[PDB]
Coordinates of C-alpha atoms in Angstrom, one line a residue:
Chain H
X1 CA -0.2 -0.2 -0.2
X2 CA 2.9 2.1 0.0
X3 CA 2.1 3.1 -3.5
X4 CA 1.9 6.8 -3.4
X5 CA 3.3 9.7 -1.6
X6 CA 2.5 13.2 -2.3
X7 CA 4.1 15.9 -0.2
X8 CA 1.4 18.5 0.5
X9 CA 0.1 20.6 3.4
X10 CA -2.8 19.2 5.3
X11 CA -5.2 21.9 6.8
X12 CA -7.5 21.3 9.6
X13 CA -9.8 24.1 9.3
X14 CA -13.0 24.3 10.6
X15 CA -16.5 23.4 8.9
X16 CA -17.2 27.2 8.6
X17 CA -13.9 28.5 6.8
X18 CA -13.2 25.3 4.9
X19 CA -15.6 26.1 2.1
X20 CA -14.3 29.9 2.0
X21 CA -11.0 28.2 1.2
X22 CA -12.8 26.4 -1.7
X23 CA -14.0 29.7 -2.7
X24 CA -10.8 30.7 -2.7
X25 CA -9.9 28.2 -4.8
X26 CA -12.4 29.0 -7.4
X27 CA -13.4 32.5 -8.8
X28 CA -10.2 33.3 -8.3
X29 CA -7.3 34.8 -10.7
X30 CA -4.3 32.9 -10.8
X31 CA -5.9 30.2 -8.4
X32 CA -7.5 26.8 -8.6
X33 CA -4.1 25.6 -8.5
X34 CA -5.0 25.4 -4.3
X35 CA -6.6 22.5 -3.1
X36 CA -5.8 19.3 -4.1
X37 CA -8.7 17.7 -2.7
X38 CA -11.1 17.8 0.2
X39 CA -10.3 14.7 2.5
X40 CA -12.7 15.4 5.2
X41 CA -15.2 18.3 5.7
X42 CA -12.4 19.4 8.3
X43 CA -9.5 18.6 6.6
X44 CA -8.2 19.8 3.2
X45 CA -4.8 18.6 1.4
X46 CA -3.7 21.8 -0.3
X47 CA -1.0 24.1 -1.9
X48 CA 2.3 24.1 -0.2
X49 CA 3.3 27.0 -1.7
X50 CA -0.8 28.4 -1.9
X51 CA -0.7 27.8 1.9
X52 CA 1.0 31.6 2.6
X53 CA -1.2 33.3 0.2
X54 CA -4.7 31.0 1.3
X55 CA -3.9 32.1 5.1
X56 CA -3.2 36.0 4.0
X57 CA -6.4 36.1 1.9
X58 CA -8.5 34.6 4.3
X59 CA -7.1 37.1 6.7
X60 CA -7.7 39.9 4.3
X61 CA -11.3 39.1 3.6
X62 CA -13.9 39.2 6.0
Chain M
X28 CA 35.9 21.2 73.7
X29 CA 35.8 17.2 73.1
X30 CA 32.4 17.3 72.0
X31 CA 33.3 19.5 69.2
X32 CA 35.2 16.9 67.1
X33 CA 32.4 14.5 67.7
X34 CA 29.4 16.5 66.6
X35 CA 30.9 18.1 63.8
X36 CA 32.3 14.5 62.9
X37 CA 28.7 13.2 62.3
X38 CA 28.2 15.5 59.6
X39 CA 31.6 14.5 58.2
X40 CA 30.3 11.2 58.2
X41 CA 26.9 12.2 56.6
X42 CA 28.8 14.3 53.6
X43 CA 30.9 11.4 52.9
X44 CA 28.2 9.1 52.5
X45 CA 26.7 10.5 50.0
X46 CA 29.3 12.3 48.6
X47 CA 29.0 10.6 44.9
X48 CA 26.3 11.4 42.8
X49 CA 24.1 14.4 43.2
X50 CA 24.1 17.6 45.2
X51 CA 23.3 16.6 48.9
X52 CA 26.9 18.5 50.0
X53 CA 25.8 22.1 50.0
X54 CA 23.7 22.0 53.0
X55 CA 25.9 20.0 55.1
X56 CA 28.9 21.8 54.2
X57 CA 27.7 24.7 55.3
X58 CA 27.1 23.4 58.8
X59 CA 30.5 21.9 58.7
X60 CA 32.4 25.1 57.8
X61 CA 31.6 26.9 61.0
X62 CA 32.8 24.5 63.7
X76 CA 45.1 23.3 59.3
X77 CA 41.1 22.7 58.1
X78 CA 42.4 22.6 54.4
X79 CA 45.4 20.7 54.9
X80 CA 43.3 18.0 56.5
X81 CA 40.4 18.4 54.2
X82 CA 42.7 17.9 51.1
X83 CA 42.7 14.4 51.7
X84 CA 38.8 14.1 51.9
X85 CA 37.4 13.0 48.3
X86 CA 36.8 15.9 45.8
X87 CA 33.5 16.8 45.7
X88 CA 31.9 18.3 48.7
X89 CA 35.8 19.1 49.8
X90 CA 35.2 21.7 47.2
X91 CA 32.0 22.6 48.3
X92 CA 33.2 22.7 52.0
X93 CA 36.0 24.8 50.4
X94 CA 33.6 27.1 48.7
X95 CA 31.5 27.9 51.3
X96 CA 34.3 28.3 54.2
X97 CA 35.4 31.6 52.9
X98 CA 32.5 33.0 52.3
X99 CA 31.5 31.9 56.0
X100 CA 34.5 34.2 57.1
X101 CA 32.1 37.2 56.2
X117 CA 40.6 40.1 65.1
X118 CA 40.4 36.2 65.2
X119 CA 39.1 36.7 62.0
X120 CA 42.1 38.5 60.7
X121 CA 44.1 35.5 61.9
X122 CA 41.7 33.3 60.0
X123 CA 42.3 34.7 56.5
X124 CA 45.9 34.9 56.7
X125 CA 45.8 31.5 57.6
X126 CA 43.5 30.5 54.7
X127 CA 45.6 32.6 52.6
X128 CA 48.2 30.4 53.3
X129 CA 47.3 27.4 51.7
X130 CA 45.3 29.0 49.1
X131 CA 48.0 27.5 46.8
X132 CA 46.7 24.1 47.9
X133 CA 43.1 24.7 47.1
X134 CA 44.2 26.0 43.6
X135 CA 46.4 23.0 43.1
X136 CA 43.2 20.9 43.9
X137 CA 41.0 23.2 41.5
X138 CA 43.0 22.4 38.6
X139 CA 43.3 18.7 38.3
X140 CA 39.9 18.2 39.2
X141 CA 38.7 19.9 36.0
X159 CA 29.8 17.4 34.9
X160 CA 28.2 21.1 34.5
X161 CA 27.8 20.3 38.6
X162 CA 32.1 19.7 39.0
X163 CA 32.5 22.4 36.6
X164 CA 30.1 24.8 38.9
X165 CA 32.0 23.6 41.9
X166 CA 35.5 24.5 40.5
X167 CA 34.6 28.0 39.8
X168 CA 32.2 28.5 42.4
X169 CA 35.0 27.6 44.7
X170 CA 37.5 30.0 42.9
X171 CA 35.2 33.1 42.8
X172 CA 34.9 32.4 46.3
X173 CA 38.6 32.2 47.1
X174 CA 38.4 35.4 45.1
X175 CA 36.5 37.5 46.9
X176 CA 38.5 36.6 50.5
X177 CA 41.3 38.0 48.0
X178 CA 43.7 35.3 49.3
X179 CA 44.7 34.4 45.7
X180 CA 47.5 35.6 44.2
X181 CA 47.2 37.5 41.1
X182 CA 50.3 36.4 39.7
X183 CA 50.0 32.7 39.3
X184 CA 46.2 32.9 38.4
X185 CA 47.0 34.8 35.5
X186 CA 49.0 31.7 34.1
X187 CA 46.6 29.1 34.8
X188 CA 44.0 26.8 33.1
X189 CA 41.5 27.7 35.3
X190 CA 41.2 31.2 33.8
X191 CA 41.3 30.0 30.2
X192 CA 38.5 27.3 31.1
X193 CA 36.3 30.0 32.0
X194 CA 36.0 32.0 29.0
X195 CA 36.0 28.5 27.4
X196 CA 32.5 27.7 28.5
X197 CA 31.8 31.5 28.2
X198 CA 32.8 31.5 24.6
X199 CA 31.0 27.9 24.0
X200 CA 26.8 28.4 23.1
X201 CA 26.4 24.6 23.9
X202 CA 26.8 25.5 27.8
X203 CA 23.9 25.4 29.8
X204 CA 22.4 29.0 31.8
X205 CA 23.2 27.2 35.0
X206 CA 27.3 26.6 34.0
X207 CA 27.3 30.2 32.7
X208 CA 26.0 31.9 35.8
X209 CA 28.8 30.7 37.9
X210 CA 31.4 30.8 35.2
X211 CA 30.2 34.9 35.0
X212 CA 30.3 35.1 38.3
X213 CA 34.0 33.7 38.6
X214 CA 34.9 36.3 35.9
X215 CA 33.2 39.0 38.1
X216 CA 34.9 38.1 41.6
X217 CA 38.2 37.6 39.7
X218 CA 38.4 41.3 38.3
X219 CA 36.6 42.2 41.6
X220 CA 39.7 40.7 43.4
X221 CA 41.9 43.0 42.1
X222 CA 41.6 46.5 43.5
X223 CA 44.8 47.6 41.9
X224 CA 45.4 46.9 38.6
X225 CA 49.0 48.4 39.2
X226 CA 50.4 45.3 40.2
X227 CA 47.8 42.6 38.5
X228 CA 49.0 40.3 35.6
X229 CA 46.0 38.8 36.0
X230 CA 44.2 42.1 34.8
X231 CA 45.5 41.2 31.3
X232 CA 44.0 37.9 30.9
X233 CA 40.9 39.3 32.0
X234 CA 40.7 41.1 28.8
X235 CA 39.7 37.6 27.5
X236 CA 36.1 39.0 28.1
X237 CA 36.6 40.8 24.9
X238 CA 36.4 37.6 23.0
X239 CA 32.9 36.9 24.9
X240 CA 31.6 39.8 22.4
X241 CA 30.6 37.3 19.9
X242 CA 29.1 34.7 22.1
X243 CA 26.8 37.7 23.3
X244 CA 26.0 38.4 19.9
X245 CA 24.7 34.6 20.0
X246 CA 22.8 34.5 22.5
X247 CA 21.1 37.5 21.7
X248 CA 20.0 36.2 18.6
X249 CA 18.8 33.1 20.6
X250 CA 16.2 34.7 23.2
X251 CA 18.5 33.9 25.8
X252 CA 18.5 37.2 28.3
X253 CA 19.7 35.3 31.0
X254 CA 23.3 34.8 29.4
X255 CA 23.0 38.3 27.7
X256 CA 22.4 39.8 31.4
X257 CA 25.6 37.6 32.8
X258 CA 27.6 39.2 29.5
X259 CA 26.9 42.9 30.7
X260 CA 27.9 42.1 34.2
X261 CA 31.2 41.1 32.5
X262 CA 31.7 44.6 31.0
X263 CA 30.1 46.4 33.8
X264 CA 32.7 44.7 35.9
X265 CA 35.6 45.0 33.4
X266 CA 35.0 48.8 33.1
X267 CA 34.7 48.8 37.0
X268 CA 37.8 47.7 37.6
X269 CA 40.3 49.4 35.1
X270 CA 38.0 52.1 34.7
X271 CA 40.4 54.7 36.0
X272 CA 43.0 53.2 33.7
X273 CA 40.5 53.3 30.9
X274 CA 39.5 56.6 29.3
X388 CA -8.7 47.4 27.9
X389 CA -5.9 48.9 25.8
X390 CA -3.7 45.7 25.9
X391 CA -6.6 43.5 25.2
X392 CA -5.8 43.9 20.9
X393 CA -2.4 43.3 21.8
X394 CA -2.7 39.5 23.1
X395 CA -4.7 39.5 20.1
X396 CA -2.3 40.9 17.7
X397 CA 0.0 38.2 19.1
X398 CA -2.8 35.5 18.3
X399 CA -2.8 36.5 15.0
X400 CA 0.7 35.9 14.3
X401 CA 0.2 32.0 15.3
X402 CA -2.3 30.2 12.9
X403 CA -2.6 26.9 11.7
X404 CA -1.5 24.1 9.0
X405 CA 1.0 21.3 8.8
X406 CA 4.1 20.5 6.6
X407 CA 2.9 17.1 5.6
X408 CA 3.3 13.7 3.3
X409 CA 0.0 12.2 1.8
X410 CA -0.5 8.7 1.2
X411 CA -2.5 6.9 -1.5
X412 CA -3.1 3.9 -4.1
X413 CA -2.4 1.6 -1.4
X414 CA -2.2 -2.1 -2.8
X415 CA -4.5 -3.8 -0.1
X416 CA -5.6 -3.0 3.5
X417 CA -3.1 -4.8 5.3
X418 CA -0.2 -2.3 4.0
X419 CA -2.4 0.7 5.0
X420 CA -3.2 -0.5 8.5
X421 CA 0.7 -1.9 8.9
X422 CA 1.8 1.7 7.6
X423 CA -0.8 3.6 9.7
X424 CA -0.1 1.8 12.7
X425 CA 3.7 2.4 12.4
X426 CA 2.8 6.2 12.3
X427 CA 0.3 6.2 15.2
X428 CA 3.1 4.7 17.3
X429 CA 5.6 7.0 16.0
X430 CA 2.6 9.5 17.3
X431 CA 3.0 11.8 13.6
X432 CA -0.7 10.9 12.2
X433 CA -2.4 14.2 11.2
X434 CA -5.3 11.9 9.9
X435 CA -6.4 8.7 8.7
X436 CA -9.3 7.1 6.6
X437 CA -9.3 3.3 6.1
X438 CA -12.4 3.6 3.6
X439 CA -10.0 6.4 1.3
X440 CA -6.8 3.6 2.4
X441 CA -5.6 7.2 2.9
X442 CA -3.1 9.0 5.4
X443 CA -1.4 11.6 6.4
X444 CA 2.1 12.2 8.1
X445 CA 4.2 15.6 9.5
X446 CA 7.2 15.9 7.8
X447 CA 9.6 14.9 10.6
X448 CA 8.2 11.2 10.3
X449 CA 8.3 11.1 6.6
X450 CA 12.0 9.2 7.3
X451 CA 10.9 6.7 9.7
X452 CA 8.0 6.1 7.3
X453 CA 9.9 6.1 4.3
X454 CA 12.6 3.3 6.0
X455 CA 9.5 1.0 7.5
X456 CA 8.1 0.9 3.8
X457 CA 11.3 -0.4 2.6
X458 CA 11.8 -3.1 5.3
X459 CA 8.6 -4.9 5.7
Chain G
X5 CA 26.9 56.3 64.6
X6 CA 25.7 59.7 66.1
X7 CA 24.7 57.4 69.5
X8 CA 27.7 55.8 71.5
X9 CA 26.9 52.7 72.1
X10 CA 28.5 50.2 74.5
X11 CA 27.8 46.7 74.6
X12 CA 28.8 44.8 77.3
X13 CA 29.3 41.0 77.1
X14 CA 29.5 38.9 80.5
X15 CA 31.1 35.5 79.7
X16 CA 29.7 32.8 81.8
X17 CA 33.1 30.7 82.6
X18 CA 31.4 27.8 84.5
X19 CA 33.2 24.6 83.7
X20 CA 29.8 23.7 82.1
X21 CA 31.6 24.4 79.4
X22 CA 33.3 21.1 80.0
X23 CA 30.0 19.8 78.8
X24 CA 30.1 21.8 75.9
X25 CA 33.4 20.2 74.5
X33 CA 33.8 24.2 73.0
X34 CA 35.6 26.9 75.0
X35 CA 38.0 27.8 72.5
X36 CA 35.6 28.0 69.6
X37 CA 33.4 29.9 71.5
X38 CA 36.0 32.6 72.1
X39 CA 36.7 32.6 68.4
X40 CA 32.9 33.1 67.9
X41 CA 32.6 35.8 70.0
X42 CA 35.7 37.6 68.8
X43 CA 34.1 37.6 65.1
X44 CA 31.0 39.1 66.9
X45 CA 33.0 41.9 68.6
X46 CA 34.6 43.0 65.3
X47 CA 32.1 43.1 63.4
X48 CA 30.1 45.2 66.3
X49 CA 32.8 47.8 66.6
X50 CA 33.1 47.9 62.4
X51 CA 29.7 48.8 62.2
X52 CA 30.1 52.1 63.7
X53 CA 32.8 54.6 64.9
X54 CA 31.0 55.0 68.1
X55 CA 30.6 51.5 69.1
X56 CA 32.2 50.2 71.9
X57 CA 32.9 47.2 74.1
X58 CA 33.5 45.5 77.3
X59 CA 34.1 42.0 78.0
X60 CA 33.7 40.5 81.7
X61 CA 33.8 36.9 83.1
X62 CA 31.3 35.5 85.3
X63 CA 33.3 32.7 87.3
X64 CA 32.3 30.3 89.7
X65 CA 34.6 32.1 92.6
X66 CA 34.0 35.9 91.1
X67 CA 33.5 38.0 88.4
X68 CA 36.6 39.4 86.5
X69 CA 37.1 42.0 83.7
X70 CA 38.6 40.3 80.7
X71 CA 38.9 43.7 78.7
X72 CA 38.0 47.2 80.3
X100 CA 37.2 50.7 70.1
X101 CA 37.7 48.8 67.1
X102 CA 41.1 49.8 66.3
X103 CA 41.7 48.2 69.6
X104 CA 40.3 44.8 68.3
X105 CA 44.1 43.2 68.0
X106 CA 44.4 44.2 71.8
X107 CA 41.0 43.0 72.8
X108 CA 42.0 39.8 71.0
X109 CA 45.1 39.3 73.0
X110 CA 43.7 40.4 76.2
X111 CA 40.7 37.9 75.9
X112 CA 42.5 34.8 74.9
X113 CA 45.2 35.3 77.8
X114 CA 42.2 36.4 80.3
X115 CA 40.5 33.2 80.0
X116 CA 43.4 30.9 80.3
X117 CA 44.1 32.4 83.6
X118 CA 40.7 31.5 84.6
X119 CA 40.8 27.8 83.6
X120 CA 41.8 26.9 87.1
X121 CA 40.7 23.7 88.9
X122 CA 38.8 25.4 91.7
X123 CA 35.2 25.5 90.7
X124 CA 35.5 22.7 88.6
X125 CA 33.0 20.7 86.5
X126 CA 29.8 21.2 88.2
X127 CA 31.7 21.3 91.6
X128 CA 30.1 24.6 91.5
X129 CA 26.5 24.7 89.5
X130 CA 26.3 28.6 89.7
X131 CA 28.3 31.7 88.5
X132 CA 28.7 34.9 89.8
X133 CA 26.6 36.6 87.8
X134 CA 25.5 39.4 90.1
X135 CA 28.8 40.6 90.7
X136 CA 29.5 40.8 86.8
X137 CA 26.5 42.8 86.4
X138 CA 27.5 45.2 89.3
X139 CA 30.8 45.3 87.3
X140 CA 29.1 45.9 84.1
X141 CA 26.7 48.5 85.4
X142 CA 29.7 50.3 87.3
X143 CA 31.5 50.9 83.9
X144 CA 28.3 51.7 82.3
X145 CA 27.8 54.6 84.9
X146 CA 31.7 55.9 84.4
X147 CA 31.6 55.7 80.5
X148 CA 28.0 57.6 81.0
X149 CA 29.6 60.2 82.9
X150 CA 32.2 61.0 81.0
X151 CA 29.8 60.9 77.8
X152 CA 27.5 63.4 79.7
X153 CA 30.0 65.9 79.5
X154 CA 28.8 65.3 76.1
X155 CA 25.8 63.7 74.9
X156 CA 23.7 60.5 75.8
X157 CA 24.8 57.4 75.6
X158 CA 23.1 53.9 74.8
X159 CA 24.2 50.6 76.4
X160 CA 23.1 47.2 76.7
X161 CA 24.6 44.0 78.3
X162 CA 24.6 40.4 76.8
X163 CA 25.3 37.6 79.0
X164 CA 26.2 34.3 77.6
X165 CA 24.6 31.7 80.1
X166 CA 26.4 28.1 80.9
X167 CA 24.9 28.0 84.6
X168 CA 22.0 27.1 86.8
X169 CA 20.5 30.3 89.1
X170 CA 20.3 29.3 93.2
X171 CA 17.9 30.6 95.8
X172 CA 20.8 32.3 97.7
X173 CA 21.7 34.5 94.2
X174 CA 18.2 35.8 94.3
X175 CA 18.8 38.8 96.2
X176 CA 21.9 39.7 94.5
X177 CA 21.2 38.9 91.1
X178 CA 17.7 41.0 91.3
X179 CA 19.4 44.0 92.9
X180 CA 21.7 44.2 89.9
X181 CA 18.6 43.8 87.3
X182 CA 16.3 46.4 88.7
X183 CA 19.2 48.6 88.7
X184 CA 19.5 48.1 85.0
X185 CA 15.9 48.2 84.6
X186 CA 15.7 51.6 86.1
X187 CA 18.9 52.6 84.4
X188 CA 16.7 51.2 81.1
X189 CA 19.6 49.0 80.3
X190 CA 18.4 46.1 78.5
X191 CA 19.8 42.9 79.7
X192 CA 20.2 40.4 77.0
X193 CA 20.7 36.4 77.5
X194 CA 21.8 33.7 75.4
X195 CA 21.4 30.8 77.0
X196 CA 23.8 27.9 75.9
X197 CA 22.5 25.1 78.5
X198 CA 21.5 25.3 82.0
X199 CA 18.3 26.8 83.2
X200 CA 19.0 30.7 84.9
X201 CA 15.6 31.5 85.6
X202 CA 16.4 34.3 86.8
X203 CA 18.1 35.8 83.5
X204 CA 15.0 34.7 81.6
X205 CA 13.1 37.0 84.2
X206 CA 16.0 39.6 83.8
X207 CA 15.4 40.1 80.1
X208 CA 11.6 40.4 80.8
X209 CA 12.1 43.1 83.4
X210 CA 14.6 44.8 81.6
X211 CA 12.7 44.5 78.5
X212 CA 15.9 42.8 76.8
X213 CA 15.8 39.3 74.7
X214 CA 16.2 36.0 75.9
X215 CA 17.1 32.8 74.1
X216 CA 17.5 29.3 74.8
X217 CA 19.7 28.2 71.6
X218 CA 18.8 24.8 70.5
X219 CA 22.4 24.0 68.5
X220 CA 24.9 25.7 70.7
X221 CA 27.4 25.4 67.8
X222 CA 25.4 28.2 65.9
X223 CA 26.3 30.3 68.8
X224 CA 27.6 32.8 66.1
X225 CA 24.5 33.2 64.2
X226 CA 22.4 33.8 67.6
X227 CA 25.1 36.7 68.1
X228 CA 24.8 38.1 64.9
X229 CA 20.9 37.6 64.3
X230 CA 19.3 37.0 67.7
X231 CA 19.9 40.7 69.1

């Protein structure tokens, strides 16, 4: 089962903010690169480099 | 009078018994201090002997004058003993003892100037690795050594003392780290150095804990694992992450799991052997 | 330092010291204490008296004098050691006599000082011995004189039971301490009073 590995960052956000990131992912310019996938409602596989952006954008956004 | 040797003897016995491993000696040594002491002490085991050595000079503070001179006489013996002996605990003991002899003003500046012990304090002072505890006794020794010289007219030691200058790099480090304790020790060295030789030398805050919390926000740096060949290899590789305590998440119906970066390598090794 | 201060130390010589086992150390400690006391202020003076079994005697009479004080004390005590009044041959000591001597000295020093300003004095007793009924009138006479004089009599009982001394401190408004651990003598002298 050690078939495949992928370095990624695991984000453990709340059931409120997660969809916000998704929204960040789409309807965005130079984006949609951001989320690898939604593993759980709470957790997402995302970014790497994008994490700095996702966090900052969330901050700036309401 | 006969009682005197007996009573104090019992505490000599107690210190002797739990002499080796820890730091039992300090309290008992003090009691022992009051009641050729140095010559006789020398035979006894080093640790504890040094402890007694340390506190006795401190304890001195007419007949007292006689005592100091007597101590001065065998300052060399302790000094010979100090070197040669030279853990952090031991190291603390050797400088603490040296420091104590220094305040007494019994030690000969010459002799001290050319001795390994002075090199050793700045050596530990230089190295980043030494702990805060070693640092404070090392620092104190230096301060006391300089304190001892109330002249510098005739004090070769106030040359080697200059070895403080070497410390600045160490202070730069220490500063880089948030080690306030170390820095304070440095300042004491500087201030003391200047002192000896000065003549010769020319609500509202509620938003501030919230602004601190704005600098912390979570995610983890991570490996994901997928496309696992059969369930036994998820469960082995998963249980071997869970005992390593670096599972961030798991879902057995996905055959998918997550490890933070610090145990990527123990997983990469277990994936290769079994 | 403005006020001249005389501290008289009465040392109980009794052979009870034998029980102590040691006199030599006791003297060394007392000397250290005196040196500190004299060093604290220019105006401090010290007088030392020995209350022996047979009689009271003056060991010594400023800090500059300390070297003199040390020699005078060592020599004086050695003379005292004599066999008579040996061990508990005589349980008591002549404290009344010692106190009388102390008050006389304090008075004389005071008169000279009277020419000048006021003097403050206190008496310290290092007590090894036991009190006796015969002693009551004489001791109390001296004690009461001190109280009237407003001279505190402090007492450090290394051992034995001198009730009169305990009473003496109470009347005098002085301090009385029965020392547990006699080897801690130096600490008591410095700390206690």
